[PDB]
Amino acid sequence: GVGISTGTFNNQTEFKFLENGWVEITANSSRLVHLNMPESENYRRVVVNNMDKTAVNGNMALDDIHAQIVTPWSLVDANAWGVWFNPGDWQLIVNTMSELHLVSFEQEIFNVVLKTVSETKVYNNDLTASLMVALDSNNTMPFTPAAMRSETLGFYPWKPTIPTPWRYYFQWDRTLIPSHTGTSGTPTNIYHGTDPDDVQFYTIENSVPVHLLRTGDEFATGTFFFDCKPCRLTHTWQTNRALGLPPFLNSLPQSEGATNFGDIGVQQDKRRGVTQMGNTNYITEATIMRPAEVGYSAPYYSFEASTQGPFKTPIAAGRADGNPRYAFGRQHGQKTTTTGETPERFTYIAHQDTGRYPEGDWIQNINFNLPVTNDNVLLPTDPIGGKTGINYTNIFNTYGPLTALNNVPPVYPNGQIWDKEFDTDLKPRLHVNAPFVCQNNCPGQLFVKVAPNLTNEYDPDASANMSRIVTYSDFWWKGKLVFKAKLRASHTWNPIQQMSINVDNQFNYVPSNIGGMKIVYEKSQLAPRKLY
Amino acid sequence: GVGISTGTFNNQTEFKFLENGWVEITANSSRLVHLNMPESENYRRVVVNNMDKTAVNGNMALDDIHAQIVTPWSLVDANAWGVWFNPGDWQLIVNTMSELHLVSFEQEIFNVVLKTVSETKVYNNDLTASLMVALDSNNTMPFTPAAMRSETLGFYPWKPTIPTPWRYYFQWDRTLIPSHTGTSGTPTNIYHGTDPDDVQFYTIENSVPVHLLRTGDEFATGTFFFDCKPCRLTHTWQTNRALGLPPFLNSLPQSEGATNFGDIGVQQDKRRGVTQMGNTNYITEATIMRPAEVGYSAPYYSFEASTQGPFKTPIAAGRADGNPRYAFGRQHGQKTTTTGETPERFTYIAHQDTGRYPEGDWIQNINFNLPVTNDNVLLPTDPIGGKTGINYTNIFNTYGPLTALNNVPPVYPNGQIWDKEFDTDLKPRLHVNAPFVCQNNCPGQLFVKVAPNLTNEYDPDASANMSRIVTYSDFWWKGKLVFKAKLRASHTWNPIQQMSINVDNQFNYVPSNIGGMKIVYEKSQLAPRKLY
Amino acid sequence: GVGISTGTFNNQTEFKFLENGWVEITANSSRLVHLNMPESENYRRVVVNNMDKTAVNGNMALDDIHAQIVTPWSLVDANAWGVWFNPGDWQLIVNTMSELHLVSFEQEIFNVVLKTVSETKVYNNDLTASLMVALDSNNTMPFTPAAMRSETLGFYPWKPTIPTPWRYYFQWDRTLIPSHTGTSGTPTNIYHGTDPDDVQFYTIENSVPVHLLRTGDEFATGTFFFDCKPCRLTHTWQTNRALGLPPFLNSLPQSEGATNFGDIGVQQDKRRGVTQMGNTNYITEATIMRPAEVGYSAPYYSFEASTQGPFKTPIAAGRADGNPRYAFGRQHGQKTTTTGETPERFTYIAHQDTGRYPEGDWIQNINFNLPVTNDNVLLPTDPIGGKTGINYTNIFNTYGPLTALNNVPPVYPNGQIWDKEFDTDLKPRLHVNAPFVCQNNCPGQLFVKVAPNLTNEYDPDASANMSRIVTYSDFWWKGKLVFKAKLRASHTWNPIQQMSINVDNQFNYVPSNIGGMKIVYEKSQLAPRKLY
C-alpha cells in the first residue's frame, strides 16, 4: 500500500563452499536510483556531423559522425564488475579461485517514490503518479551495453545512482577519404543520408509490455539462467620459444653465479631435431618446430572503412595496441571529491604473454644464407610505400590455422561481464569487451520512464510540446548474480603472485576525511598456467 | 497501513515467583527515539591529534590521539541498568535476591513516523520515505558499547531519547615518550600513520541486510538467549586476617566495657600452628598460614604504551585506584533542570574488601630479626629511583597462583549489563565494565539510518555533497530483558544492610515542581557472604 | 623378501574440500634416512662444565654446564613445519585459511638396506644384518623435540637426511653467583654433583619393544589421533587504546588533506564516561575504562636461578625481547652451496600487537596533578638501584587477572608443530615453542639403531670396547600428517595482506645453476581479526 515496504536492501556477497572444490558465489547488489522526467516525450532522429574537425587534413580518426534515435526512456545497466564486488571479494576470488562460471541473474525494482516540484521550491508526493517499467525479455530492442560509455550503475552501495538515457544507432551513410597534413585539395567528406532498406525505428510501447508501478508495487524479473564457458583466472606465459623439450646441455656451469651460463656443446649445423626450413641444416631455438603458434600479428592502428565510416580494426591480445584504455568518472572509481570534467584513465596491461613485439620481427629470403645481407632482409626499420614511419609490421597478418589465443581477462571494476553473440551466419571466436558471451538468449534490458503528468491545459493539436508537472522518481534496485568457481590447487614448489595491500596502495581502499572514495583497478589473472 | 498502530507501549517489570526460591524478572523498556538525518552520507576517516596539549611536558595522560571511521548510521544501545529498572525495582532486587542470571533479550522498532521540514517552519509527513534498520546478528561489525561514553538510551520512560552516531577505531601508530615539568628538549611526539596489514574498513551495506521500514511496518529482532554465570548480590568482608580458626583466648574479659580486651596468654615464640616463615619461631596473625590470598596488589597509576599510545593498566578491585568514576548528563541521571555542560560525577566505592592499603605494606629481609632496623626494611615511605613521591608499592605486583578475587558488582544505573568476550587465544578471567560477559555469541547491534531523500537536481558527478530534503524520524523502541534470580535466606542472628529511603535521600526519587528528575546511584552488593 | 619393495614414496599434499567451508589437508613426507653405527654401544654419563668462560666476571649468560646421558640410539624427528609443506602449500594455507586443526599422524620405515665397508673401500651388502627400531608409544622416555636444536629431518624431498643421536638431561646441581666486569673476588662457581633422590637412568631396551628389521620388512606406527585446540591464522591489531566506542568528534575536517584533523570539541574535564581514576575529572584515551588488558609487561633479560643454574625467563609475546631467533644449517633452509660452519639466522617479528614499548611507560603518584613534576613520576629513564642502564621497566610485571593474550604463531619452516603438556599439577596457559600442545597422550618417539655386527674375536671380559664390523643403513621414512582447516571469508571493504612472490624474493624459491636451494621464512598470521 502507501505505507508498506515492498522489498529489502541486501548488498552482501555469500560464498557457499560445496565439496569437490566447487564454490557458489552469490553477489547481491542494491542501489537507490534517482530518475528525472524526460526532456521530451518524443522519439528524435538526430544526426551528429563534426565536419569542423574532420575538414582539417589529417584528422580522420577524430570522426564522430552518426545518426541516432533519442528515446524518452532510460536504461538500468548492471553489466560491470564493480556493481557486484568490492576490493575484498575481488581479492578473495582472484587469489583462491582458478575458473569462474556465470550461473544466474535476477533483478527487482521496489519502494517507488514519486514527487513533484513547485517553485523557493516545495517537494510534494504524487501518491497516484506512476513509473513505467519495461523489460525486453524477448530481446527485440537493440542491445546497448553501458559499460563502454561508463554509464552503468554506481560502484558504491551508499551512493545514489542515476540511469542513463537510452538511445540507439540509426542507419546512415558516410564516406571520408583520408588525407595528411599537406594534401592539396579537399578530400571527400560527405554525409550521404539514409538507405531506405536499412531503416529500423524501434519503440518500447510497440515491443514490450509496460507495467505502471505506483508507490506500493514491486517489479521482479524472474531469474535468467546463463549457459556459457568458464572464464579462467590463470594466465599463460609460454610463447613459442618455450614449448616442448629443451635442448640437452652438454656443459653445465660449475661455479654458480650471475654470469655463468650453460653451453649446448653441439654445433648448430650438426644437431638433431625437426625444422620446417627444408633447405637448411641449422637447428636453433628460432628455427626448431613447435606444435602450433601462440598468438598472432595484426596490422596495428589500421582503419577499415565501410558504408558508415572508418573504424579501428580490433586486436585480440596486446603486447601500445591491444591494451584497452578505460576513462571514467566519479560514480565509477574516480576520487569522489575531485573537481573538473577530466576523467580518470588507466591502461590495463594484462599478464598473459600472447602479443608480439614488432621491433623484433623480420622477413628474410628463402635461401637462408645466415649472416643475412641487406637485399635479403625486410626489417621493422625499412620504409614501406616510401613512408619513414611505416614499416612492414603495420600491414602484417599472421593469423592462420595454427594460432592459439586466450579469451580476454576480467577488468575490475569497469569491465563488462556478459555480452550477446552476433546474429550473423559465422560467429567470431571471441569478443574483446567481456569474458562471457551469451550464446542464444541472454538477459533482457530494463527500461524505466516516469509517466506523463499533465496539467489542465493540454490540447494535442498544438505543435508546441506539452506542459507537464515537474516529476521525479526515486526507487530501489536489487540484483542477484550467481557464479560458480573452482578453488585453485598448488602444483609448484614456488609460491605464486597474489594481490595484496601494502604501504603504497594503502589509501586506495579507505575513505578520506571528507568522505572521498575511489576504486582502483585490480588485475585478474595472477597465477601462471602450464600451456603445453 | 498508514493509520494502524504496529505495536504497544509496555514499561512494566514483572516478578514471577516460581517455587524452589527462583524468580523470573521480566523487564520491559519502551522509549520514543528521535532521529535526524546524517550530516554526511559518506564514511569518513578522521584523525584526532591533540599535540597542543601533549607538547607541554608532563601531559602524557592528556593524550587523545586516535583515528576513527565516522559512519552515517546511528546505534541504538540498551546495555545499561537504568533502561530496565527504576529505583523501586532495584531496591526489590538488591534487598530480596542473592544471585542474578541473564536469560533473554529481545527488541522491536514500531510506529515509525517520518517528517520533512520546509522553511517560519512547516512540518509535513513523508508517507513514502523510509527508515533503514540493520541488525548485526552475526556480529561482524566492531562491538561498541555506549555505556562508557554514557550514550545509551535515556533512563526515563516519559522522555524522548536519541541514538548515538556510530563510529569505530581505525588502526594507527603513535609514539609518545613521557616527560616531566622540567625536561630539557622536546620528547618524541609523532603520529606515525597506519600500518597496511591492520587496515579494516567496515560498512553496514556490505555486512548486514537492511530493512526499509515505512510508516506501517515493524521490525522485530527475535529473542536472543544468553548463557553466562550468575552475578552475586552478596559481598565478602573476609581478608586474609580473618580466615580459619582464631587463636584460643586464655584470658577473657570479666568486666564488659569499651576498652576491656582479651589476651592470648601464650608467648608468641611458644605458640602452635603452621607458618610459611621456616626460619622463625613467632606465630602471630600476620605470619600464620592462611589457605590462599584474597586480592592482590597492582602497580597503581601505571601507564603501558603499545603501538597506539599509552594507557592506564586496569585494576580488578579497588580499595583512589580501582574505583570507577562515572560522568553523565541529563538523559542519564543528572537533574534534568540544571544548566551548563558540566556533567554529574560519582565514584562507586564498592562494599567488598578485596583491595589493598599500600600505606600498610612493607618488605623485610629474610633474616627476620623482629624489631626491624632501617637497612632491613622497605617501607611505603622510601624513595624508589630517587623520587620523593614514588615508593615500591607503585611498581608492585602480587598476583600469583593463590589469589582469589570477586567479579565486579552491578552499578545502577550507569553500569553495563553484558559484554562480549575477547576473541583472543587466552581469555581474561574477568572484565571490569560489566558483571556479565557473553562467552560465544551475544546480541547483535541495532543500527538505524534515515534513507536519503533526494531533490530533483542530483548528479553523482558533482564533487560537492548531494542536496537532500531535511527529514527526521521518530519511532518507538521496545525491549524485553529476562533475568533469573534467587531469593535470599537469613543465616545470621543479626539483621543485615538494606537500601532504604530516609529524610536525607528523600527528594532524589520524586520530581521537583518544574518536572526535574534525577536517578542517584545505588549500591548493589549489600548483604555479607561467608567466604571460607 | 630380498628383492621385493616394501613401500612406496609419496610426498604430495592433498587438499580435500569438504563443504561447509572445511578442508582436510593431508601432508605426505618421504625421506631417505642414512644411519651410521654408534660410536660406542654403551650409555655414557657425561658432564659439561665450561668454567673457563664463566670464571671471567660478567659471563653468567654464557653458562653451558649440565649432565647428560648419551645413548647409542638415534631419534627420527618430524616435528617441524618444513618437513610437510613447501612454500606453495604454505602460501595456499596462510592465504586461504583462517584456522587449522591437527587431526592425525602416522609413520613408517620401509626399504631397509644394510651395508658393510671393507678397507680403497669396498661396500658389500649384509643381507642378514638388522636395524633395531623402537617406538615409545606409552611415552616412558623423556621427550626431546629436535626442532630447538634444529636437528629434525631435512626440508628437501630429494636430499638424503640423517637422524640425530639421542641424549637426555641427567640431574645435577649448580650454583653460579653473578658478577660484573669489576667485581673483586671470585664468585661461587661450582658443580655440586647429583642428588640421589632425582637420579633417573632410562634405557630403550628396558622400556620399549624393539623390532629387528632386515632387508625385507616394514615397520608401521599406527595412526595417532590428536585432540587439541585450533591454531588461528589471523592476527589481532587492537591494543587497549582501540577497544570500544570512540569519542564523538564535534568538529570534523572540511578540507580533506594530510594535516587536517578532527577535534573532540569538549574540554577534558567536562567529558562523559567511566574512569578507574576515582579522584580525577579528566577523561582521555589514556584514562578511559577499557574492558580488559591486551598483553602484559614482563621483566626483560631477567635470569632466574634454580637448583641447576640460571635461565632466561620466557616471554609470551614480543614487541628485541619475545621475538624468537632461529639459527639453522644446510639441511634446514640455508643455501645448500654455502661454505663454513656459520649458521643462517633470522628473528621472527610477528604481526600481532600484544607486546609493550617500555620507552613509553611511566608511573605517577596517585594525586594526579596532571603536568607532572619530577618527584611524582618514575620514567623509563630513571636509575633503579643506582644503575644507569637499568630502569623500572626491567623489574616490572603487569600480568594480572585481566590480561588477554594470543597463542604463538606457526613459524615456517623451522618451528615446531606439537608439544607435550607438562606433567605438573597446574599447567601453563601456553607454550612459546609450538602452536599445538598435546593434552594427554601424544605421539611416541621413533628411535633407530643398527644392530651390533661382531667379529670372531669377541670376549665380554675385555675392558676395551668390542670390535664391530663397520656397518651402515639407509632406509626410507614416510609420514602422513592430517590437518583440518577453515576457509576464510572477507568481511571488510578493503583487501588484506597476502603472501606473494615479487622481484625481490624471486630467487629464494628456485634453485641456482649448481643446485643450490634455500627455504626462507614466511609469516603465518597475515589477515587481521576483530578482537572486540
Closest CA to A474 of A5, A36, A4, A30: A36
If you search the block for the grid coordinates 598476583, which residue do you land on? B399
For chain A, what percentages of helix, strand and coil (3-state, to nearest 5) are there?
A: 10, 30, 60
* Cβ contact, residue pair B463, A3, below 8 Å: no
Residue C303 CA to residue C311 CA, distance in Å, equals 5
Give B210's contacts in chain A (Cβ within 8 Å): 8-11, 30
Contact C142, C41 (CB under 8 A): no
Comparing CB atoms, the residue among A8, A30, A331 nearest residue B460 is A331
For residues C332 and C413, give the distance between their C-alpha atoms in angstroms, rounded to a whole number: 8
Min Cα separation C192/chain A (Å):
53
Please name the amino acid found at residue C8. Answer: T
C-alpha span between C450 and C41 (Å, rounded)? 10
Beta carbons of B478 and B470 less than 8 angstroms apart: no
Best residue of A23, A492, A510, A524 to probe chain C, by most C CBs closer than 10 Å: A492
Q: Among candidates C33, C294, C330, C64, which has minimal Cα distance to C176?
A: C64
Nine-digit cell string for A456: 489542465
Calculate how close chain B gets to C499, using CA atoms only, in Å. Answer: 11
Per DSSP bridges, beta strands A231-232 and A234-236 are unpaired
Helix (H, G, I), strand (E, B) or coil at B62: helix
Q: How far apart are CA B530 and CA B238, in angstroms?
A: 8
Conformational region of residue A304, where left means phi above 0, alpha means psi within -120 to 50, and beta covers everything else: beta
The beta strands (E) that lie in B296-342 are given as: 302-306, 309-312, 321-328
Backbone angles phi, psi at B332, to 5 degrees: -125, 30
Q: How far apart are the C-alpha atoms of C156 and A225, rounded to whole Å? A: 49
At A284, list the grid cell.
636453433
3-state class (DSSP) for residue A270: helix
For A307-353, the three-class secondary structure string (H helix, E strand, C coil) is: CCEEEECCCCCCCCCCCCEEEECHHHCCCCCCCCCCCEEEECCCCCC
CA angle at A385 for the pair A381 and A388, rounded to the nearest 5°: 40
**B contact chains, 3+ CB pairs < 8 A:** A, C
Phi, psi of B192 (to 5 degrees): -75, -30
Q: Which three cell numbers stand for residue B313?
A: 593498566
Are residues B105 and B224 in contact, defined by beta-carbon separation less than 8 angstroms? Answer: yes
Query: Do residues A452 and A458 make contact, with C-beta atoms less than 8 angstroms apart?
Result: no
Query: CA B324, CA B343: separation in Å to the nearest integer?
Result: 15
Q: What is the resolution of this structure in A?
A: 2.4
Residue carrying the nine cell digits 522491536: B108
Q: Which run of H or of E encompasses C95?
A: helix C87-96
Distance (Å) of CA C512 to CA A461, A493, A495, C339, C483: 88, 14, 17, 15, 33
Backbone torsions φ then ψ of A211, nearest 5 degrees: -95, 140
8 Å CB contact between A243 and A255? no
Instruction: Tell me whether residues C356 and B304 touch, CB distance under 8 A.
Output: yes
d(CA B164, CA C246): 11
Please give the single-letter amino acid code of residue A283: I
Q: CB of A272 within 8 A of CB of A247?
A: no
Structural element, H or E, at residue C404: strand C403-404
DSSP H or E stretch at residue C51: helix C51-54
Closest approach of chain C CAs to the CA of A90, in angstroms?
8
Q: What is the residue whose three cell numbers read 578505460?
A: A326
Per-residue DSSP letter, A301: T
C-alpha cell at B460: 553523482
Dig out the grid coordinates for B513 from the structure: 515542581
- DSSP conformation letters of B462-483: -SSPPPB--EEEEEEEEEEEEE
Neighbours of C (≥3 Cβ pairs closer than 8 A)? A, B
Neighbors of chain A with 3 or more C-beta pairs under 8 Å:
B, C
Q: Are A81 and A190 in contact (CB under 8 A)?
A: no
Instruction: Please tell me which of the candidates C282, C400, C405 has its beta carbon nearest to residue B425.
Output: C405
Between A252, A337, A501, which is nearest C497 by CB? A501
Cell numbers at B475, concatenated = 519511532
Question: CA nearest A201: which of A235, A173, A170?
Answer: A170
From the list C261, C264, C402, the residue facing B428 with the nearest CB is C402
> Which residues from chain C sit within 8 angstroms of residue B318, using beta carbons?
276, 278
Are C247 and B302 a contacting pair at CB < 8 A? no
**A339: which chain C residues are within 8 Å (Cβ-Cβ)?**
none
DSSP three-state, residue C92: helix
Task: Answer yes or no: are the C-beta atoms of B397 and C399 closer than 8 Å.
Answer: yes
How many contacts does A have with C, using Cβ atoms within 8 A?
A: 130
Cβ pair C324, C348 in contact under 8 A: yes
User: Which chain A residues are closer than 8 Å to C487 by Cβ?
Assistant: 15, 17, 96
Q: Is the omega angle on the peptide bond into residue A413 within 30 degrees of 0, that is, cis?
A: yes
Annotate C423-479 with DSSP letters as a single string: -SSS--S--SS-S--B-S--PPPEEEEEPP-B-S---TT-SSPPPB--EEEEEEEEE
Handedness of CA C361, C365, C366, C370 (dihedral sign): negative
For residue A198, the SS3 value is helix
Cα–Cα distances (Å) from C473 to A494, C107, C470, in that order, read 33, 18, 11
Hey, are the CB atoms on A256 and C337 less than 8 Å from each other?
Answer: yes
Cell 527488541 belongs to B107
Query: What are C404's three cell numbers?
Result: 588477554
Q: Do the Cβ atoms of A506 and B456 come within 8 Å?
A: no
| Residue at C198: amino acid letter | D
Residue ranges of the alpha helices (H) in B17-167?
51-54, 87-96
Number of structural domains in chain A: 1
Minimal CA separation from B105 to chain A, in Å: 25
Helix, strand, coil: what percent of chain B each, to 5? 10, 30, 60
In DSSP notation, C263-306 reads B--S-GGG--EEEEETT-----TTTBPPSSEES----TT-EEEE
CB spacing of B45 vs A512 below 8 angstroms: yes
> What is the 8-class DSSP label of residue B334?
S
Cα separation, A59 vs A187, whole angstroms: 11
Of B170, B458, B461, the CB nearest to A329: B461
Joined grid coordinates for residue C81:
613445519
Query: Residue A495 contacts by C-beta under 8 Å, 6 or more apart in sequence?
Result: C87, C88, C90, C91, C499, C500, C501, C509
Cα gap A135→A443, rounded to integer Å: 9
* CB C61, CB C163: distance < 8 Å: no
Which of C94, C294, C364, C425 best probes binding to B when mutated, by most B CB atoms within 10 angstroms?
Answer: C364
Which domain covers residue A333, as residue numbers? 1-532
Of B201, B385, B434, the CB nearest to C384: B385
Q: Which residue of chain C comes nearest to A251, CA vs CA?
A: C513
Report CB contact under 8 Å: B40, A330: no
Alpha carbons C481 and C28: distance in angstroms, whole number:
7
CB contact under 8 A, A494 and C254: no
**CA of C408, closest CA in chain B: separation in Å?**
9
Q: Which residues of A touch B127 (CB under 8 A)?
A: 2-3, 125, 127
Residue with cell 533502561: B83
Give the chain B residue whose CA is nearest to the CA of C390: B385
Q: Sign (positive/negative) of CA torsion A194, A195, A197, A198?
A: negative
Which residue type sits at C23? Answer: V
Q: H or E stretch including B191?
A: strand B189-193
Q: Closest to C17 (Cβ–Cβ): which among A17, A490, A493?
A: A17
**Do residues A68 and A167 lie in contact, with contact meaning Cβ atoms separated by under 8 Å?**
yes
Beta strands A22-36 and A471-487, pairing class: antiparallel
> How many CA atoms within 13 Å lie on the side-chain side of B170?
28
The continuous run of DSSP H or E covering B35 comes out as strand B22-36
Residue among B63, B144, B23 nearest B306 (CA):
B63
> Strands A164-170 and A293-294: what pairing?
unpaired
Given C284, C368, C528, which is nearest B198 (Cβ)?
C528
Q: How far apart are CA C412 and CA C524, in angstroms?
A: 7
Q: Identify the three-state secondary structure at position A73.
A: strand
From CA A363, how far away is CA A365, in angstroms rounded?
7
The Cα-based distances of C516 to C159, C346, C504 in angstroms read 12, 19, 18
Signed CA dihedral, B395, B401, B403, B407: sign only: positive
Assess contact for C87 and C519: CB atoms under 8 A.
Answer: yes
Identify the DSSP state of A266: S
What element of type H or E holds C53?
helix C51-54
* Spatial CA neighbour of C101 closest among C410, C472, C451: C410
How far does Cα A90 stand from its chain's mean position?
Answer: 17
Residue closest to A91 by CA, chosen among C89, B69, C491: C491
Contact B206 A86 (CB under 8 A): yes
C242–B59 CB contact, under 8 Å: no
CB A483 within 8 A of CB A14: no
CB B242 within 8 A of CB B234: no
Alpha-carbon distance B156 to nearest alpha carbon in chain A (angstroms): 30
How far is A308 from A171, CA to CA, in rounded Å?
8
